[PDB]
């Protein structure tokens, strides 16, 4: 009887009501422990493909206007409503984004380096080595999947030929084509790691059930009389 | 606490748990009815 709530085909900026799982799967059995209850929430459909040209428009760099930078219950970072042309779409907000700012979304692969302004989306080839980036996509057109948390910025270590190396926040180096689009700057809510829960009830407000109260080298034969 | 009152009646719950439509939903439930028909039960299901 479990029908997923993620059944909306068409993009909208209206917040969408979420049904909670409880750590259980479509079978009805717990698959992850420690999830339950909490505050009711609404899902605002984020758009991680920064360079999405508007319908019936050409594929070239465009600009959008930041309406508001808002708190999002469903993620560590904060979201910014951005409007351009006749389209409104939620997006992740960088560290310094404010209302009324203008942010560029560029398709052009700069043959030379392009000056980097935080919040604008540029292909990795355009950016210069060393620039802090966020919302990186693995393959051109996929959409952003890495560096999407609060205050998490990766570095662009190297660009050679058609590919570049990205240092993910975990210090794990990844390689992607220079065509991939990465947003510049940090991801905002840099102090999220400084937040203090304080009381056990606060985690029960975020849907975190308490931990359960339940409290390997086989010797080789030649080394069993010394164990 | 005092036990013995584990039955909290509800017609919606009863017909959903042990009703005609529920029994026919799975083949094992159909065989529940087949046994009771063979035995001669006056009540096949709730």
């Amino acid at each position: 009887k479990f029908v997923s709530w993620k059944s909306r085909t068409k993009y909208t900026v209206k917040p969408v009501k979420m049904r909670k799982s409880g750590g259980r799967d479509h079978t009805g059995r717990i698959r992850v422990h420690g999830i339950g209850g909490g505050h009711k929430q609404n899902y605002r459909m984020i758009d991680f493909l920064r360079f999405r040209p508007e319908k019936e428009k050409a594929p070239e760099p465009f600009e959008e206007k930041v309406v508001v930078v808002r708190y999002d219950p469903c993620r560590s970072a904060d979201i910014a409503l951005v409007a351009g042309g006749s389209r409104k779409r939620w997006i992740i907000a960088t560290e310094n984004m404010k209302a009324g700012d203008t942010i560029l979304n560029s398709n052009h692969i700069g043959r030379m380096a392009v000056a980097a302004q935080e919040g604008d989306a540029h292909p990795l080839g355009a950016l210069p080595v060393g620039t802090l980036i966020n919302n990186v996509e693995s393959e051109p057109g996929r959409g952003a999947q890495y560096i999407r948390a609060a205050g998490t910025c990766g570095v662009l270590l190297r660009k050679v030929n058609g590919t570049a190396i990205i240092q993910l926040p975990s210090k794990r180096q990844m390689q992607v084509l220079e065509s991939c689009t990465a947003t510049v700057g940090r991801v905002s809510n840099v102090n999220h790691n400084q937040r203090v829960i304080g009381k056990a009830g606060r985690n029960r407000w975020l849907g975190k059930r308490p931990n359960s109260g339940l409290w390997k080298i086989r010797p080789l034969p030649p080394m069993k009389s010394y164990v | 606490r005092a036990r013995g009152n584990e039955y909290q009646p509800s017609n919606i719950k009863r017909k959903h748990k042990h009703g005609w439509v529920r029994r026919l939903s799975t083949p094992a439930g159909v065989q529940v009815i087949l046994r009771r028909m063979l035995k001669g039960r006056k009540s096949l299901s709730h």
Binding site: - | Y7, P9, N11, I12, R14, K42, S43, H46
Partner: protein
Amino acid sequence: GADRMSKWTSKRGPRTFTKSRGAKKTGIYTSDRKFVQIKEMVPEFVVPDLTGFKLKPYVNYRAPAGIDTPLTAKALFQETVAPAIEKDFKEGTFDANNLEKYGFEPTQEGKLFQLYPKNFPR
């Protein structure tokens, strides 16, 4: 402790449970919950004029009862259809194609009262 043997009716169960007692529907429920009764769906009692009717509920005990001969298709056919076909055959004005002339109906479609599937109540 529920009663498994008594009949399930609308008096039992919560308010949400409702079901009919066997009365035929006379209308339709539109959206926004408006009942619209249909005049044609409501039965009409066709009552004859009984003025000057000689038949009353009971019969004379002196009246002889008759031997039972339940009606058969052959008896109906002979009483009604045989006289025409027999006379027509002698006249020679007979063919298989014109069976409608004697009262045959190839199909029941289009008739107000269809003999099969029956479309009228008693």
